[PDB]
């Protein structure tokens, strides 16, 4: 579990887990006039972890204002920082900048401006990430294609070293979608994640505003991916607002692992709030949130919605059917695979509402509503504030029936003896007596 959000007035956050026991995160500060650096051995622990500022802007000309989204990378044995900025004389001409150092420590070593990364297009770019597939080292990063009518487009390139590309680009998408428009015609913030033998390449489209969202292009790992022909991109965003849970324009990604290494997880930006305040570029209240990527049982990511503020939730498998999972439908409860729509199977276990040591499991989707039974069924409703409420959503933590050392099973608070179980797959509270009654009414939390 986390708990949302991780950094407040902190905007395109990176972070990195490198090999020496340490998560490192920077992120775009308000002031736009510095790169910030923090480390925690945990990624709970970033969230009070103190921050080093590492580099400053310059006084006059080039990497003057605008210093925008940087990225910190472990390539060859040095630490690399890639971000944006713009000049003095004009904060719009914005090109991209790489630092290096060969410390050990990034936050206490010293610092080196490799320059610009040279590209055969003078223009707008930014949001510069690294990535390796098979061996070879890309570049991915945003820019104006100066023959196209909009912002910034995606572009991928081979490196002859960390702050240099080798060859040509290719430019692999380009905003045209309706959703992609809005305010702004931009593709920024590529970001990349591998499974499967595939690759996913993340990316920001539209205006800061709250109609920022991700899109995604897929390509196999297997091909040529400065072949323009090999990216294919979702026709709509694969993660965006949800008024729900009220987070609003979630973007500028990044992805880092869990502790033991065997979660992905999803690194992101996004405001509580739907309308901008003040000048769009000064509203400083964007911040960072972190929540695990699920994986598709056609290899494809599930970034789900953005979660509720607070802990993070979790999913809920049956013991004797592992692949399927507690789920609303049409608001009744069930067990199901390839939960297409992720946050329908996702809760959040929360103190009990009829109190004495319970808890409660309210939907992710639907805050306020809870996991409730009524002619002993299974439904997702809304807390109501009544008595009857409280007591048929408040359930006792059990050691699982059929796994008392790593499952979990529910007895109702109101109805003692009964437990949530499933049958015929639809969710019910009935006592246990069987060893099928049992399996029935085992379940496992994030397994
Ligand atoms: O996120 C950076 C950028 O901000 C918005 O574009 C503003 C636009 O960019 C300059 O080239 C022009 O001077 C200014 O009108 C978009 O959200 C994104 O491209
Ligand atoms: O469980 C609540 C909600 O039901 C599912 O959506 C219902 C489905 O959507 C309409 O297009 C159909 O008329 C209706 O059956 C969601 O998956 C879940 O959040
Ligand atoms: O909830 C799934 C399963 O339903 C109940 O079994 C009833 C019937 O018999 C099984 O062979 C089929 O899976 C099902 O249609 C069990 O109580 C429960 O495990
Ligand atoms: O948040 C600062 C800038 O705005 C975003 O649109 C860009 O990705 C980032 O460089
Ligand atoms: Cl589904
Ligand atoms: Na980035």
Same mark, same amino acid.
């Given at each position: 579990?986390?708990?949302?959000?991780?950094?407040?007035?902190?905007?395109?956050?990176?972070?990195?887990?490198?090999?020496?026991?340490?998560?490192?995160?920077?992120?775009?500060?308000?002031?736009?006039?510095?790169?910030?650096?923090?480390?925690?051995?945990?990624?709970?622990? $970033?969230?009070?972890?103190?921050?080093?500022?590492?580099?400053?802007?310059?006084?006059?000309?080039?990497?003057?204002?605008?210093?925008?989204?940087?990225?910190?990378?472990?390539? #060859?044995?040095?630490?690399?920082?890639?971000?944006?900025?713009?000049?003095?004389?004009?904060?719009?001409?914005?090109?991209?900048? *790489?630092?290096?150092?060969?410390?050990?420590?990034?936050?206490?070593?010293? !610092?080196?401006?490799?320059?610009?990364?040279?590209?055969?297009?003078?223009?707008?770019?930014? #949001?510069?990430?690294?990535? *390796?597939?098979?061996?070879?080292? /890309?570049?991915? !990063?945003?820019?104006?294609?100066?023959?196209?009518?909009?912002?910034? &487009?995606? =572009?991928?390139?081979?490196?002859?070293?960390?702050?240099?590309? %080798?060859?040509?680009?290719?430019?692999?998408?380009?905003?045209?979608? &309706?959703?992609?428009?809005?305010?702004?015609? *931009?593709?920024?913030?590529?970001?990349?994640?591998?499974?499967?033998?595939?690759?996913?390449?993340?990316?920001?489209?539209?205006?800061?505003?709250?109609?920022?969202?991700?899109?995604?292009?897929?390509?196999?790992?297997?091909?040529?991916?400065?072949?323009?022909?090999? !990216?294919?991109?979702?026709?709509?965003?694969? =993660?965006?607002?949800?008024?729900?849970?009220?987070?609003?324009?979630?973007?500028?990604?990044?992805?880092?692992? %869990?502790?033991?290494?065997?979660?992905?997880?999803?690194?992101?930006?996004?405001?509580?709030?739907?309308?901008?305040?003040?000048?769009? +570029?000064?509203?400083?209240?964007?911040?960072?949130?972190?929540?695990?990527?699920? !994986?598709?049982?056609?290899?494809?990511?599930?970034?789900?919605?953005?979660?509720?503020?607070?802990?993070?939730?979790?999913?809920?498998?049956?013991?004797?059917?592992?692949?399927?999972?507690?789920? /609303?439908?049409?608001?009744?409860?069930?067990?199901?695979?390839?939960?297409?729509? +992720?946050? #329908?199977?996702?809760?959040?276990?929360?103190?009990? +509402?009829?109190?004495?040591?319970?808890?409660?499991?309210?939907?992710?989707?639907?805050?306020?509503?809870? $996991?409730?039974?009524?002619?002993?069924?299974?439904?997702?409703?809304?807390? #109501?504030?009544?008595?009857?409420?409280?007591?048929?959503?408040?359930? %006792?933590?059990?050691?699982? $029936?059929?796994?008392?050392?790593?499952?979990?099973?529910?007895?109702?608070?109101?109805?003692?003896?009964?437990?949530?179980?499933?049958?015929?797959?639809? +969710?019910?509270?009935?006592? *246990? %007596?069987?060893?099928?009654?049992?399996?029935?009414?085992?379940?496992?939390?994030?397994?």
């Amino acid at each position: 579990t986390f708990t949302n959000p991780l950094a407040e007035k902190r905007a395109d956050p990176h972070i990195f887990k490198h090999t020496d026991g340490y998560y490192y995160f920077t992120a775009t500060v308000p002031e736009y006039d510095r790169i910030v650096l923090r480390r925690a051995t945990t990624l709970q622990g $970033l969230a009070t972890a103190p921050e080093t500022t590492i580099w400053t802007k310059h006084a006059s000309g080039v990497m003057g204002a605008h210093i925008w989204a940087p990225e910190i990378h472990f390539i #060859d044995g040095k630490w690399y920082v890639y971000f944006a900025a713009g000049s003095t004389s004009d904060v719009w001409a914005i090109r991209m900048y *790489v630092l290096e150092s060969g410390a050990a420590n990034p936050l206490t070593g010293s !610092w080196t401006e490799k320059g610009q990364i040279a590209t055969p297009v003078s223009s707008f770019s930014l #949001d510069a990430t690294t990535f *390796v597939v098979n061996g070879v080292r /890309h570049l991915a !990063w945003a820019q104006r294609n100066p023959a196209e009518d909009n912002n910034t &487009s995606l =572009f991928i390139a081979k490196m002859a070293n960390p702050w240099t590309i %080798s060859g040509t680009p290719t430019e692999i998408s380009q905003p045209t979608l &309706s959703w992609e428009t809005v305010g702004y015609k *931009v593709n920024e913030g590529p970001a990349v994640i591998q499974h499967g033998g595939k690759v996913f390449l993340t990316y920001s489209a539209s205006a800061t505003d709250a109609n920022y969202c991700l899109g995604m292009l897929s390509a196999s790992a297997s091909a040529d991916l400065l072949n323009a022909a090999s !990216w294919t991109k979702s026709s709509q965003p694969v =993660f965006k607002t949800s008024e729900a849970t009220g987070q609003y324009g979630p973007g500028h990604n990044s992805f880092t692992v %869990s502790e033991d290494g065997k979660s992905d997880i999803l690194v992101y930006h996004d405001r509580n709030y739907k309308d901008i305040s003040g000048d769009p +570029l000064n509203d400083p209240n964007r911040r960072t949130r972190l929540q695990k990527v699920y !994986w598709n049982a056609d290899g494809t990511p599930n970034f789900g919605i953005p979660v509720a503020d607070g802990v993070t939730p979790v999913r809920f498998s049956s013991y004797n059917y592992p692949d399927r999972y507690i789920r /609303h439908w049409d608001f009744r409860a069930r067990i199901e695979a390839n939960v297409t729509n +992720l946050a #329908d199977s996702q809760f959040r276990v929360v103190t009990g +509402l009829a109190g004495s040591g319970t808890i409660s499991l309210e939907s992710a989707n639907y805050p306020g509503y809870y $996991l409730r039974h009524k002619n002993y069924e299974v439904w997702v409703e809304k807390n #109501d504030g009544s008595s009857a409420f409280k007591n048929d959503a408040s359930f %006792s933590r059990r050691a699982g $029936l059929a796994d008392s050392a790593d499952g979990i099973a529910f007895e109702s608070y109101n109805y003692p003896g009964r437990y949530l179980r499933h049958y015929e797959n639809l +969710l019910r509270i009935q006592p *246990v %007596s069987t060893a099928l009654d049992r399996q029935d009414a085992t379940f496992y939390a994030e397994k």
